[PDB]
Design a protein around this ligand. Structure first.
Ligand code: ADP
Ligand code: ADP
Lengths: 231, 50, 148
């Protein structure tokens, strides 16, 4: 809102469960700060700016940051897959992730947190491909039914977590949230499938009632005919 | 690339659906016919025991 | 309503069965306060702001808070599931939750209360998926009958 005084030492409060990277171009010296601290630029120090993917159907270069959110969060993506039957499906998925940071004082490890430029879109496309592959070898019915075990193994190959060793990300779970045929005429063909399923249960009570009607009607006739003879 | 190929692939799935609706309707009918006979087996035996 | 005096030490009454997180950027020191107490910011201390999910069909970033309600409550969600028969169902569910806090003096445990940014939408979607999975392998009649 108001022009900042440029003669003032430039500081930044780093949020909890995050990290910034700052390089000193004069003293030729690197550092990465973790967590809830305040970081102050020197005369010639600079921040790294991270350009990240954002959006529903994730697009690169939609968000910009100075701190890397290390901490456990999720991000959500919309995929389009296709089955061995050529049924075109649209999926809502969510990825629980975090950064294992073995040693925070280790300058060689800690720099790798910033290796992969766009760690969001990297894990999206790298998982969205693992899912499109397994499901073209699987049929629709099998997938409409086992979508949860299918997708889990396509992501976690022979395994509770997918590690990405370049930067150290992991993905501990995938929540599948919606599976939909793209085309409407496919959704109609699936609509007549349930109208039948209903009539199959109404026909079964009407046939189970009739069999009980016919059983009792005979238990009377058995006695009414025996009673006439005893008279 | 071509759209008319994507149409030819579209009719491929309309069949795949009808193949599963025909299979529940044939699997229901076989269960209907099995129970209808389990009653007839008893209703006919019950008349003779009377 | 009236502009607060800025030269006044900033305090906050923390409600029962709740907790706030406050960091001191000068003395480089963290603390989490529990319960019904009053918390006063130092010269350079700050609060954590929690952005949380709210709404009928829960949307992220609809509520903002400074205290974490630890205590036993419920939240309610509307799901859409589907059966092995392709019967599309809409469910009204409610989740009774609370935070086990083993040691309140333990600074390593107590910070984890604030790890997960949006603990509401996290448990919603993580449960809404567990429900959509089992029910596509179950038929309608069986579910209309044994849904519980
Ligand atoms: N400063 C940051 N550093 C690291 N990661 C971030 C930062 N800001 C946002 N992100 C992550 O990038 C992702 C951007 O995707 P987003 O559009 O927020 O997904 P959603 O649709 O689930 O909200 C989010 O999951 C978020 O956790
Ligand atoms: N300050 C807070 N700290 C922690 N949790 C909160 C806070 N305020 C609200 N919540 C919880 O977040 C949830 C928001 O969902 P809400 O829309 O209130 O659900 P409902 O539709 O059941 O009222 C509530 O269950 C509430 O208990």
């Amino acid at each position: 809102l108001a022009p900042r005084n440029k003669t003032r030492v430039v500081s930044y409060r780093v949020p909890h469960n995050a990290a910034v990277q700052v390089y000193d171009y004069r003293e030729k010296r690197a550092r990465v700060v973790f967590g809830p601290e305040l970081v102050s630029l020197g005369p010639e120090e600079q921040f790294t700016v991270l350009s990240l993917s954002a959006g529903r159907p994730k697009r690169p270069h939609a968000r910009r940051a100075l701190c890397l959110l290390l901490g456990p969060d999720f991000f959500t993506d919309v995929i389009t897959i296709e089955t061995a039957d050529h049924a075109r499906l649209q999926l809502q998925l969510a990825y629980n992730w975090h950064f294992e940071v073995n040693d925070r004082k280790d300058p060689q490890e800690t720099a790798k947190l910033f290796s992969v430029p766009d760690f969001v879109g990297d894990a999206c496309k790298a998982i969205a491909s693992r899912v499109r592959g397994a499901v073209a070898s699987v049929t629709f019915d099998d997938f409409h039914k086992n979508s949860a075990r299918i997708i889990r193994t396509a992501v976690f190959g022979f395994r509770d977590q997918a590690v990405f060793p370049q930067n150290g990300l992991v993905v501990s779970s995938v929540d599948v949230q919606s599976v939909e045929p793209v085309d409407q005429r496919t959704r109609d063909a699936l609509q007549r499938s349930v109208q039948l399923a209903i009539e199959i249960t109404t026909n079964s009570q009407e046939a189970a009632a009739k069999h009980e009607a016919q059983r009792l009607e005979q238990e009377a006739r058995g006695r009414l005919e025996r009673q006439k003879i005893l008279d």
